[PDB]
């Protein structure tokens, strides 16, 4: 009931758990055999992005639709190479040309981020609105950033 | 038969009713749980409006059609944020792209 960083304390073994302290420098040695060529995987062409909803909130209050025109249907990953937005889902399924939904949480009031998707990337941009409740019962999911300007 | 503001008068209890006087300052504390996200409800895109009929009258003599292109069919509200026009109906039903 007094430890810093919100640590829980247990006695067998003597230990502290769930300390929200620092970061873990993970290093991954991925074998050369596990990689797959760009040609095999679904290749995306002529994509467009739009934030059909944005709630600047701790949880994934942000929704964005990506209109896609894929070279072949299947499944492939989605990411944001920046700390502006953190996505709920890792990969999405695609059917020729259509639309897909991406959930995310954001820090920027005027969000703009490069959504990397399936050997391409689309510049998602929009304006975002404040959340409902002052206090929430779970920790932050989106990386804080300096920019929250007009 | 003489009261101001058109009040009706009754005797048990002694009282006046239907006095068209003043206004009531209503205050509503709406719970946070009753609100619904914009994403869930039907979202309207690329709407157009036209007054297919207007009769400046005490009753709802004015008619207007809204051509809509909705994101998903359902029901949702309609209002006028101004004192210029007062609507008879509160909400309307929408079917993909059409008219209401």
């Amino acid at each position, epitope marked *: 009931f007094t430890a810093p960083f919100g640590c829980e304390i247990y006695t067998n073994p003597i230990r502290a758990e769930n300390c929200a302290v620092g970061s873990i420098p993970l290093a991954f040695d991925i074998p050369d055999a596990l990689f797959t060529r760009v040609s095999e995987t679904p290749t995306l*062409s*002529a994509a*467009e992005c739009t934030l059909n909803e944005c709630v600047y909130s701790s949880d994934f209050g942000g929704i964005a*639709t990506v*209109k*896609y*025109s894929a*070279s*072949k*249907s*299947g*499944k492939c990953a989605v990411h944001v190479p920046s700390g502006t937005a953190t996505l709920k889902e890792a990969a999405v*399924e695609l*059917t*020729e*040309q*259509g*639309s897909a939904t991406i959930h995310f949480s954001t820090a920027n009031i005027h969000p703009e981020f490069r959504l990397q998707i399936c050997t391409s990337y689309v510049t998602c941009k929009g304006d975002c609105h404040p959340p409902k409740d002052h206090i929430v019962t779970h920790p932050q999911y989106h990386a804080q950033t300096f920019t929250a300007a007009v | 038969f003489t009261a101001p503001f058109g009040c009706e008068i009754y005797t048990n209890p002694i009282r006046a009713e239907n006095c068209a006087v003043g206004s009531i300052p209503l205050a509503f504390d709406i719970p946070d749980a009753l609100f619904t996200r914009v994403s869930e409800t039907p979202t309207l895109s690329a709407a157009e409006c036209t007054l297919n009929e207007c009769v400046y009258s005490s009753d709802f003599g004015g008619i207007a059609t809204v*051509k809509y*292109s*909705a*994101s998903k*069919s359902g029901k949702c509200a309609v209002h006028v944020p101004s004192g210029t026009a007062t609507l008879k109906e509160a909400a309307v039903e929408l*079917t*993909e*792209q*059409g008219s209401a």
Partner: antibody, heavy 120, light 107 residues
């Protein structure tokens, strides 16, 4: 939402070019895909190909690719089909709809279809 | 192309009967499958999109299910206006294709 209407029915001579237009009303062609599908009376539906509204790219049925051209006409809010070197095997009802796929609702509108008879 | 195999090709039924039509894709199409109804001399009509979503204006006696390669169209209790040809279709893996159709005739 969207209404589609194929141009009128009639004859095309063997070896000549079948040409159809689809006119969209109550909606623009500035989104989605725009498609032609045909049906030989009594039989099934065969997808011919599509044009993607936003970028104009086309995809064709492999069995027809060598003979088919699709195009979009922004000035009339129309799109068209050209099918070269027809034979009697191309007699069919041709429908124009938002086939392939759209970023929010496709193939929800199917043109009533127009009968093209290939005949000498 | 992705080959769509519809089963059965023909079905005889009576008003009130429960009807099931199956659709098999040559490869996985996740949930990207639509069902259409077509009557003689008329254009197809969308009934179900993305395997299980009922199109607005379509009665709830129509329902769709399945994912991957196997899909099902169920008509809970067949009505007179339900006698027609039904087609499945996948918008997936170059290109988009239809099943051969299921003709539902009056027993």
């Amino acid at each position: 939402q969207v209404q589609l209407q194929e141009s009128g029915p009639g004859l095309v001579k063997p070896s000549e070019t079948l040409s159809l237009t689809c006119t969209v009303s109550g909606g623009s062609i500035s989104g989605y895909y725009w498609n032609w599908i045909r049906q030989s009376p009594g039989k099934g539906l065969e997808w011919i190909g599509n044009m993607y509204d936003s970028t104009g790219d086309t995809n064709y049925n492999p069995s027809l690719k060598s003979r088919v051209t699709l195009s979009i006409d922004t000035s009339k809010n129309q799109f068209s089909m050209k099918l070269n070197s027809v034979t009697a095997a191309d007699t069919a009802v041709y429908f124009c709809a938002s086939g392939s796929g759209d970023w929010f609702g496709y193939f929800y509108r199917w043109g009533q279809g127009v009968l093209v008879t290939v005949s000498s | 192309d992705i080959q769509m195999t519809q089963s059965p090709s023909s079905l005889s039924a009576s008003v009130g009967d429960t009807v099931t039509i199956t659709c098999r894709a040559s490869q996985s199409i996740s949930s990207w499958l639509a069902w259409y109804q077509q009557k003689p001399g008329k254009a197809p009509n969308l009934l179900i999109y993305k395997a299980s979503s009922l199109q607005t204006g379509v009665p709830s006696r129509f329902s769709g299910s399945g994912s991957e390669t196997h899909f099902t169209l169920t008509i809970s209790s067949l009505q007179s206006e339900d006698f027609a040809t039904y087609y499945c279709q996948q918008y997936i893996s170059r290109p988009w294709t239809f099943g051969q159709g299921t003709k539902v005739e009056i027993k």
